[PDB]
Design a protein around this ligand. Structure first.
Ligand code: INS
Ligand code: INS
Ligand code: MN
Ligand code: MN
Ligand code: MN
Ligand code: MN
Ligand code: MN
Ligand code: MN
Lengths: 252, 252
């Protein structure tokens, strides 16, 4: 059973257990507060549990938004965001996804990202190409007019500066899956200078952007580095290229 | 035949023959320039071309994005947008719909709005009430500590103010469909004062929205009143309650 066979299973299973919850704002209570502050809706937990029901038997560490960490001493740890974008999901906004990330000794091994309503498996092995349902995806070739980013800026962020250079603005309110929309050349880039995105949100899509050509810098335009934890919020800047990144970095 | 049945029929046909196309930015390409200006792309013309098949035997007036406007000197006028949010559609962003607005002597009569990705019919008869797939829909009870608005601003639009007063930005690139979201209680609002939206984007939802209880309006809040042609761009502010309208108006 390969790592994707693992992930893919989990995601499909999760798919069926929780789709009748999409929009159903009346069907979901909160079951508790998680490490990062965020509230765990029952839809959230339920998804993470199916994940836990598979990775439980194996000897591996776990990182997972709701539940937090579960160190098992292995040179293998998985990072799952059981639902990337609980909001959109409960408010019937069709921008959610499942995030599965595997790390051998804190190093990129294989990232799974499943966007439920498209049936789109975004996955990629460390050094082996980033794909889309098989099809070979890669970031987009920059265009100094046709830029199309999605942002989550800070107060100090000059907005008019940005918006004048950007050709199209989108903001789908799920940063992981938005990364993958960079992964395939849809989006030119997507940042978040308002430290919110935790490890568990960007893990699986970290690995895929890498294997697709994205840059994935931090605030000061430096090679983003992070720790495997369901805590600590950080500044990420996934991008299309230098030039793009260039553009971003300054406006901040 | 009941309009609603005719609206649904066309929709299904459209989805039958272009959902395959979804995301495949390769297979498509520009085909003409629309009267409004815009570039017509094959999926668009394929979609429209299927509409007119059904709506030309009816000998009704017809008005749509690509072709423009066919005058049959009837009391009845169909207004069509074969794909709302082309861009996203041809670029894997799962946010796009079919807009079927039927007018009785330049006066709202019926409205269909179809979210292909979600199997969601947004329909409304004048004086009947806004429906989603059966369930009855209304906007959402305002709450300043929880606004969720989408928007497309120009120059004189204080972005400082907006993001600071609101609690969640969600820009989606499909105004027509966004209207149905500001009509089912997903967003508190969505305005477009970067005059790009046209009759064919709003029309069918202008209905649905109203009966759902929203307060559509123009620049200076004086109720939205539009002609029925494929050109003539026009500001607009589909709002939750008056507070929203206020706020949108304040910032403006
Ligand atoms: O789109 C984001 C997201 O939904 C976050 O959960 C919220 O805290 C932010 O303020 C909003 O802008
Ligand atoms: O969402 C819209 C849209 O997709 C248009 O194509 C683009 O010209 C606008 O700049 C963008 O904000
Ligand atoms: Mn959360
Ligand atoms: Mn989550
Ligand atoms: Mn998440
Ligand atoms: Mn267009
Ligand atoms: Mn269109
Ligand atoms: Mn449109």
């Amino acid at each position: 059973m390969k790592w994707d066979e693992i992930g893919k299973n989990i995601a499909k299973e999760i798919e069926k257990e929780i789709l009748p919850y999409f929009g159903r704002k009346d069907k979901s209570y909160v079951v508790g507060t998680s490490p990062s502050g965020d509230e765990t809706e029952i839809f959230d937990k339920i998804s993470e549990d199916i994940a836990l029901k598979y990775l439980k038997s194996l000897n591996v560490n776990i990182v997972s938004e709701e539940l937090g960490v579960i160190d098992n001493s292995s040179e293998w740890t998985v990072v799952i965001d059981p639902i990337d974008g609980s909001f959109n999901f409960i408010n019937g906004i069709p921008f959610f996804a499942f995030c599965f990330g595997v790390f051998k000794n804190n190093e990129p091994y294989y990232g799974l990202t499943y966007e439920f309503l498209t049936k789109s498996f975004y996955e990629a092995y460390k050094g082996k190409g980033a794909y889309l349902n098989g099809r070979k995806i890669k970031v987009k070739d920059f265009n100094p007019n046709n830029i199309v980013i999605s942002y989550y800026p800070s107060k100090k962020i000059d907005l008019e500066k940005l918006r004048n250079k950007v050709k199209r603005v989108r903001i789908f309110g799920a940063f992981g899956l938005e990364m993958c929309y960079v992964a395939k050349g849809t989006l030119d880039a997507v940042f978040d200078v308002r430290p919110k995105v935790r490890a568990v949100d960007i893990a699986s899509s970290y690995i895929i952007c890498k294997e697709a050509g994205a840059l994935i810098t931090d605030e000061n335009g430096d090679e983003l580095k992070f720790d495997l934890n369901a805590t600590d919020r950080l500044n990420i800047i996934v991008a299309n290229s230098k030039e793009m990144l260039d553009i971003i970095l300054d406006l901040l």
